[PDB]
Structures are given as structure tokens and as C-alpha cells.
Amino acid sequence: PHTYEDPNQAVLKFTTEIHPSCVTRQKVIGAGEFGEVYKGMLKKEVPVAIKTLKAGYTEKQRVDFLGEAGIMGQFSHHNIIRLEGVISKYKPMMIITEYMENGALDKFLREKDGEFSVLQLVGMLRGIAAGMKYLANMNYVHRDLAARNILVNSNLVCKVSDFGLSRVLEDDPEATYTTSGGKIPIRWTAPEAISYRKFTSASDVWSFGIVMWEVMTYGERPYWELSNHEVMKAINDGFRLPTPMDCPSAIYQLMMQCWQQERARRPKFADIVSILDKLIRAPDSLKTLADFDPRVSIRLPETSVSEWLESIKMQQYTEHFMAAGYTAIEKVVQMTNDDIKRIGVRLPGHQKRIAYSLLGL
Ligand SMILES: [Cs+]
């Protein structure tokens, strides 16, 4: 429905007002768009993440901050972060969520470089795809799916985590690193979303393919060394991300499927989940690896009578071909081997060469 576009209504309907006394802040664990993030306890008491709103906020800033919880409270899935509640009546504003001990996915994979199996990475991807399938069936377009917005708990369960609003695109074109601000980065956004602001579940599928690449590389940066402008031009001209090291051919095949230029040709999230589950339940399909070239940060785009005789070094037969009536190409491609014998190509090697060449035409 439209319950994803009204933050105040969402806060009213889908959040639980928590009293400040029930919250105990313990230790800073991150720095968010709106303020600091703490690990603490919520009342037996349970560990939780506590997002706070920096003092001196604008009214619209307050609205946008609590709107994330308004969205999050509408969901309920194993692979979507759980909302305990919010503090809105007393300062500072706060959002309470389940604690994810291992934090952001990309940082975690970097810390655990090479410490998992390809099967475990594909299982993480399956969990993320399950969360995104849930979101898509709820008619929710994330617009900002990336490994940094996926959290990981003790049991390596991955959950989608960032449900902000007023999301706008990265405007810095000469940049190569991460830009300042809570913007949607160009490197994870589908082409139509950049060019025409057409964010759909298919653009989320594109970003999910980027997340797949992220995981298979243990948290590398997409389009490394390239600039946002170079990334946009590359994607428009057909370039794509290259094969990760030690990547199953099936997984890179699926990534490339997610990155189809025409959004309609991309797989839906149900298809994604089915493919990943099939692969996991038959892990022998993950041993065939896709070719790896350590030099590339991007894959190249894909491609769309005398001359023919000289292509095979038989130009000296040209006059013969002209004398027997084979003056045009359209009639030669319809030529049989007995016609070749008849015209004067008596040597067997020449017959064989002309025949193999003819097969192509
Ligand atoms: Cs409420």
C-alpha cells in the first residue's frame, strides 16, 4: 500500500513507545546519519542497538529519524532487522533494534577474509535474498541495498537494516571513495534509477547483484579506482563488474543476470532465492569456477567473392568462380561440395578448406 510514504502515520501505527528508564546505554558501536549508535540493554533485559538523534535537530530531521522505525516496525522476517520500539516523547530521540553482534556485512567479511567457505557465502546471499523477497512481496522498494546496510548476528544470519526516507542520489561525479552524507551511492544503483529516478524491485535486484559481488570478494569496493562518472558511462556502454576470485560460475552467471540493462529481463527475488537454494542443496554445482583475471576492475562489453576467397588464401580461384556463374555471394553460400568439384577445385585440401569456410556463411 502507501504506508511506506507517511513517516508520522507509520510511527503512530507501527512503533512501540518505550520509556527512557527501560533503556541502559553501555558502549558506542558506530556513527549513524543522525547521531551515535550504542549497544545497551532493554527491559529479563535483552541486548539491543540504540540509535540516537543528535541534539539540536530540525522538526523535519526528527520526522525523518523516527520514520525509519515507522517503516521497520511494519516488517517481520528472519532476515529483516527487528524493531523493539522508539523513544519519541523525551529527548534525545531513540530507535531500539535487536543487537547484531557482528555488525555490518562488508566490514565483517573484510575482518574474516578467506575464513568462510563458498557455501557459507552463498548461504548469506540466500538469507539476504529471502529478506529482499519478503520486502518485494510487501511492495517495499529499498532503493539503497548494499553490504554496509546488512547486519550480521552471532549465528552469521544476515538481515537488511537501513530503512530511511528522503533518500537522494550521490551527486559527486569525480569521486572514487565514499562520499559524505547519507546519499544513495551510484555504484549500487541501477542505470534507470540513476538516469530517470525509476527505483523498482528490479533496481533492488541490480543492487543485490552488486551485493553478491561484495560478498564473493570479502568486502571489496565495486568499480575500484573508477569514478562515479566513469562507472555510469561504463554501465551505459555495457561494461560490468569482473569475476571475483574463486567464484562459482553459477554465482557470477546470476550476478550478471541481475545486471541486465533492461530491468524487465532481470530475475525477480523469488527466482534469486530459488536459484541460491538449489545451488546450496546441490553444492557440487558450485565447484566450477568462472575465469579470473587479476588485472581487471571491469568486464568489457559484449559484441553485437574475392574477399572471401582471399580470407582462406584461395583468391587465385576467383576467376574460376566468375566463369562458372558464381559471381555473387548469395549463390556461393548455397553451393554444394559437388558444385565445388565441378567448378574446378580438384585438390582435396582445397575442397576441404572451401567446405569448412562455407559452413560458416
Ligand atoms: Cs505508538
Numbering used by the authors: 591 to 633, 639 to 899, 909 to 965
The article reads:
EphA2 promotes cancer malignancy through a poorly understood non-canonical form of signaling involving serine/threonine phosphorylation of the linker connecting its kinase and SAM domains.
To determine whether the negative charges introduced by phosphorylation of the linker might affect the kinase-SAM domain arrangement, we solved the structures of two EphA2 phosphomimetic mutants. In the first, we replaced both S897 and S901 with glutamic acid, since glutamate is known to at least in part functionally mimic a phosphorylated residue when the effects of phosphorylation are due to the negative charge of phosphate. The structure of the EphA2 S897E/S901E double mutant shows a different kinase-SAM domain arrangement than EphA2 WT. In the single molecule of the structure, the SAM domain is completely detached from the kinase domain and the C-terminal part of the linker is fully extended. Unlike the EphA2 WT structure, the activation loop is fully resolved in the S897E/S901E mutant structure, potentially due to stabilizing crystal contacts. We did not observe any substantial differences in the overall fold of the individual domains between the WT and S897E/S901E structures, and all EphA2 molecules in both structures adopt the active DFG-in conformation. The EphA2 5E envelope best fits the more elongated conformation of the EphA2 S897E/S901E crystal structure, but in general shows less agreement with the crystal structures, suggesting that the EphA2 intracellular region adopts an ensemble of conformations in solution that is shifted towards more elongated conformations by phosphomimetic negative charges in the linker.
